[PDB]
Amino acid sequence: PKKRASNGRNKKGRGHVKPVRCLNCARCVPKDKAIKRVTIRNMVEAAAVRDLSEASVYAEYALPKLYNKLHYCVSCAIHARIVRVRSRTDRKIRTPPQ
Amino acid sequence: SQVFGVARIFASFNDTFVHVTDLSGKETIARVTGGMKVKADRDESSPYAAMLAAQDVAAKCKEVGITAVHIKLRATGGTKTKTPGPGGQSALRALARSGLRIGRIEDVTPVPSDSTRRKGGRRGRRL
Amino acid sequence: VLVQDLLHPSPATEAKQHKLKTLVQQPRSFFMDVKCQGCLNITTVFSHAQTAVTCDSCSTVLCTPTGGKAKLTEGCSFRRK
Amino acid sequence: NINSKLALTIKSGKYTLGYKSVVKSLRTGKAKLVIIAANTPVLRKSELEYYAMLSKTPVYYFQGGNNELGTVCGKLFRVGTLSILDAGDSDILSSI
Amino acid sequence: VVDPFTRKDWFDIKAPTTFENRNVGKTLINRSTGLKNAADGLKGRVFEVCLADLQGSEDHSYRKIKLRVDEVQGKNLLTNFHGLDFTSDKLRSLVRKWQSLVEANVTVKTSDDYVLRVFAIAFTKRQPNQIKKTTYAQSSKLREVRKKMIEIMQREVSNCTLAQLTSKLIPEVIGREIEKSTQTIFPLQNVHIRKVKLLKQPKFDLGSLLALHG
Amino acid sequence: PGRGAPLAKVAFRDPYKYKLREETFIANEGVYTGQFIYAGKKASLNVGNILPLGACPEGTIVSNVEEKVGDRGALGRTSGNYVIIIGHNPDENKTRVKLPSGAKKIISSDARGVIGVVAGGGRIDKPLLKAGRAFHKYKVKRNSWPKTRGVAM
Amino acid sequence: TKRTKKVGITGKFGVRYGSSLRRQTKKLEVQQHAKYDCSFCGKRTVQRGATGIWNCKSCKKTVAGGAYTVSTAAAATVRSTIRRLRELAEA
Amino acid sequence: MRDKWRKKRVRRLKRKRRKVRARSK
RNA sequence: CUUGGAUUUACUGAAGACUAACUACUGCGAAAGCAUUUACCAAGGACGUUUUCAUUAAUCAAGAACGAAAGUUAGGGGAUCGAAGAUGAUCAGAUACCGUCGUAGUCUUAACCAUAAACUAUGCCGACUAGGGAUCGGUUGUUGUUCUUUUAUUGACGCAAUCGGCACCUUACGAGAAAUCAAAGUCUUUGGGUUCUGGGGGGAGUAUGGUCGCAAGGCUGAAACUUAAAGGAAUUGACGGAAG
């Protein structure tokens, strides 16, 4: 039977969406279907943010961030626990996790 | 004040390059890779190998007169991954803890404005 | 609402309806008498005019057509007929 | 746009089509405008505008060839040049 | 076997007077020998230094300047402007979702015949009283803004020499004028000249260059 | 006869004595009878004009190009072929061009060429279909056809 | 009536030379015997002489063209490219 | 077997029948 | 692949592709599809309209136009990936998955092909039946808001209506075997108009004839024979080299 009303993608009123390659396995996946996560991480791990600030030649220099947008296909994301299997009724919930 | 070089760190998932040049980048001062510190291929990109590689780089810098460096970290880029390898974080901390002074830090990963086909095929690499 | 006076809708709610969706369809447009500031000559102008109307005396554009109602130029006063 | 104005003159006014009629119409001073096709030979062109300079007649240079000038006038033949004798319901003379 | 660093001679890099802290740093090259002079193989080098370093202030931390050496006087290197660029992280921090990104570029030559390509970038501004999630501008307005960018960069470059323009880039004169000039089109934020490239240089004039070094 | 490219006969005046000089140029496509041909350093970029290589910007399509200054045309003379100007070296007065074989050549910037593509192109697209057609083709070229295979002697 | 279903002008060649050579010949041989529009007088009276030679019967102007068409695509591309490059050079 | 490969098997087998029948043309 | 200096580094140049980030349960198109700027060319829906014509219309065998990718023919291009092929591994075996090379192809110009899970597995036109909040395009009334420029005749934003779209949320009058459905409702209380298709499972989209195609193949399309099930949705369990 039909498992999801959205067919696992985000294509409505559209014929074709150009594909993207998965970061993990380089599989061609439609842009609307890919599981996308935006991550803004510190470029230096919190253990080294002190000694690198002390080693800085600049007083009060702010470390730049690392901006990245990751694209995954369905097999990579499920395997890497980026998304998880939800119950039949819990699948419908599409608000971001709290 | 300080005498700056440029530490061009290329951290892939198979190796870690610690490469210090001058300001122009046309003159190479020290290039120690994580593969020169281990005899196993599987840990050429290990954080441990990158730390040893950075210390050898820092030691070479001191005897030439380089007292501070700017950091230009990069990943493989191109059609491949844009996140830096595990050795890039260790080589930066090792350089700072070795008495070398740190200047500007920048990510200089080459990023296409949409470009060539990536290896692996349509169905990806099946594992 | 099961019981409702369809033959005598409230004139307030009747005016919010689309022009084709009233009991009897009726245009919301009208005709205006336009006084340009320069002179005084009655000129009948449609509210939703599609033409750059010019008064006979001086060849000055009175209004510019838009998507909906025509826009009267500055100094031009209108009175609905 | 100028084509729409010219079509009305052909429909309502008076005109002559062709090089021999245009030169005759320039001699008599009955021409209000001379229209020359883009692919008209330059020698004929530079001669038509010498007659128009003498006749004191403005000249409009059609952008298409004599194949396109003929069909604008509603004709099934080629028109290398034409003269407008009477602009009628149109306002082509006021638009050069 | 030979330790190639025994034959290196150190030189000092001097920035033009348009900046404040003109002592950029030091470089090295193989020592001048009979066959090859150190001077000729040293000119043409490009140094990429942060604009915050050339001015002290951290407000220029997101711009980095390329300096091209084209005259050597003993141990001093006389550099010139070679290009402008933003840091990668600054641009990535400006490109958010639920908003429109607009870019423009134009090729234009200065008064002294320096051919440049100048890249402008801007983003739609969310109004203080705005309620809707996204801030999108209609494509017709974006075409007018893009057109407005191009005619401002063309005007403010062709009317001045490269040195005055360098003094224009530091305070975002062009970016502030674009923001002011597009107020009646659409509210804008983060209007920046994010990159400048030198394409073609005029015939070398050492005297003109020397005036930019004191 | 013997050429795929048509030839153009162009009449010039003699600058020093009262006489007409008829030249035989290779016709570029688009050149017509009665057309004015301009030749020299100051000639304009029009089809059929003869210009020095330095006066033509990159990407200019040119034919009958001089290999050496004053040899009156050596390169790109057959039907459908041409030379693309790749770039200039004004300090050494040299120009880089791309030849019909795909080779890049460096020629003096004073060498001349004719603007356009040699007329008659697309000739090879049609099969000859007959031995007689090749016989008539080589009847006005030279005695090189037909060829006996060396393995059959 | 319609005399040949598909050979057309290549019916003069009978059954010889192979279908691929005959249909490839037919395409290019219709073009070389066609009448083209004259850019000078406007009539469709231009016909080929030898290869590269296209004459107009009316105004007697001869223009150098392609082997089988009055103008090739490469020349048309060069004509607009030269026109475009001419505008920049002459401002 | 897979429906797609069953179709390919028959397509290749249809090809053989046509070539075999052509012998007695 | 590397002391014949690889990999790396800075600067420079050349080729082809491709247009990241902005990019969304957003837009446009009959569908396939469409994402750098500008210029040119001709189109298009919606909205507005006290403009115009008056049944011109709805759906449509036959027949046309278009029709992803791959593929065919001939030129041109051939950066990157990469069928075939070659190779290093793995394995009991592995012609494969993984790794390294790589030819057609991938791009383009002239023609062919006419097929895709070409999907919404859901024909089109018309009417009605229920609430709600968003959003795109247009129109009409109106702000403790920001801004042109100092304000308007700037533009943005805010609040209401409305027509049209892409969708979404709730309910079930109602439908259904259920999964589910604002249509898949207004169907034993059975009839608004109209086009196409199916009749247990296989054999089989097979054989044959016809027709289109250069070919690969496309369209139309049986019979003999065989069988009591095959299948759909859901429930419990069992199992899973799935998650918590």
Ligand SMILES: [Mg+2]
């Ligand atoms: Mg399932």
Ligand SMILES: [Mg+2]
């Ligand atoms: Mg649509």
Ligand SMILES: [Mg+2]
């Ligand atoms: Mg599709």
Ligand SMILES: [Mg+2]
């Ligand atoms: Mg699709």
Ligand SMILES: [Mg+2]
């Ligand atoms: Mg998804």
Ligand SMILES: [Mg+2]
């Ligand atoms: Mg490795």
Ligand SMILES: [Mg+2]
């Ligand atoms: Mg390695």
Ligand SMILES: [Mg+2]
């Ligand atoms: Mg080792």
Ligand SMILES: [Mg+2]
């Ligand atoms: Mg492979």
Ligand SMILES: [Mg+2]
């Ligand atoms: Mg797996």
Ligand SMILES: [Mg+2]
């Ligand atoms: Mg005529």
Ligand SMILES: [Mg+2]
């Ligand atoms: Mg405006």
Ligand SMILES: [Mg+2]
């Ligand atoms: Mg010769």
Ligand SMILES: [Mg+2]
């Ligand atoms: Mg012989």
Ligand SMILES: [Mg+2]
């Ligand atoms: Mg032989």
Ligand SMILES: [Mg+2]
């Ligand atoms: Mg032979």
